[PDB]
Amino acid sequence: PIFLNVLEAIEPGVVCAGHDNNQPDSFAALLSSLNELGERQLVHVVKWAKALPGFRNLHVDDQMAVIQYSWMGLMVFAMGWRSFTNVNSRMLYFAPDLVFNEYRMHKSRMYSQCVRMRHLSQEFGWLQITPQEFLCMKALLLFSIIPVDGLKNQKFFDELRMNYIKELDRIIACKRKNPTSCSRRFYQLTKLLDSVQPIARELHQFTFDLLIKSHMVSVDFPEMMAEIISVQVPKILSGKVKPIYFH
Numbered sequence: 001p002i003f004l005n006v007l008e009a010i011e012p013g014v015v016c017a018g019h020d021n022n023q024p025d026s027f028a029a030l031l032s033s034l035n036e037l038g039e040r041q042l043v044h045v046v047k048w049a050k051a052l053p054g055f056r057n058l059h060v061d062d063q064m065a066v067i068q069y070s071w072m073g074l075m076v077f078a079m080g081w082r083s084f085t086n087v088n089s090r091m092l093y094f095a096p097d098l099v100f101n102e103y104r105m106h107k108s109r110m111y112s113q114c115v116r117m118r119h120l121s122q123e124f125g126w127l128q129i130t131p132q133e134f135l136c137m138k139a140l141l142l143f144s145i146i147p148v149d150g151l152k153n154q155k156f157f158d159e160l161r162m163n164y165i166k167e168l169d170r171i172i173a174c175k176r177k178n179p180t181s182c183s184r185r186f187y188q189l190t191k192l193l194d195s196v197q198p199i200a201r202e203l204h205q206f207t208f209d210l211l212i213k214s215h216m217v218s219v220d221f222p223e224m225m226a227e228i229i230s231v232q233v234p235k236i237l238s239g240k241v242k243p244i245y246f247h
């Protein structure tokens, strides 16, 4: 289980937001914690991505671009699984110190996005996603969004993405002698992966608008995040960078 040992080995641990839960909920505070949390998780997404099998093959510039484009989606996917395993989808488990109930979802002004993630959370349970399918799907998620004008080394990217899809096939086939059974499972999983993109898009859109009016809502955007929202996020929203759907 070489490939799976590695994913299990590099999976990031618990990341906290540093939120003040003794303080009454407020839009400004909730968003500042989401921003800080986002930034803390990105530190780990980079380290995780760099230790992924084959990731170093990519051109240095494609490595940073791919990580930044996939950032939101990766957090969404990982948060849904935590929400499912920790609180059986009753609340969104952004972090141990940042759990959203409907009241928080509503005050964050990202209710529709939150409800969609809760649904994703429920999907992990309904589809009985195993920890291993989760780890592979998550890694594959990192290789699911590219520029129309291509990466510096598109070919190396295509090879890598193909190899990860082949790993998922193996995880699905393992203990499934029935081809039909493997096909239906692959269908279910690629469908779940595709559902992540639309959610990341709404969060992207929301975050973009929020930054532009940041000075009007007292929200504190971290340096790195502000730069990525203004430089990378617009390419996605304008259609220059697109996610790779299966369906």
Ligand SMILES: C[C@](O)(COc1ccc(C#N)cc1)C(=O)Nc1ccc(C#N)c(I)c1
Pocket (backbone or CB within 6 Å): 031, 034, 035, 036, 037, 038, 041, 068, 069, 071, 072, 075, 076, 078, 079, 093, 094, 095, 203, 204, 207, 225, 228, 229, 232, 233
């Ligand atoms: C509102 C915002 O702070 C915006 O953060 C980002 C993150 C990535 C990009 C990009 N590219 C833009 C904003 C946010 O959605 N944060 C956030 C933090 C943690 C999780 C988890 N788990 C999630 I889903 C979202």
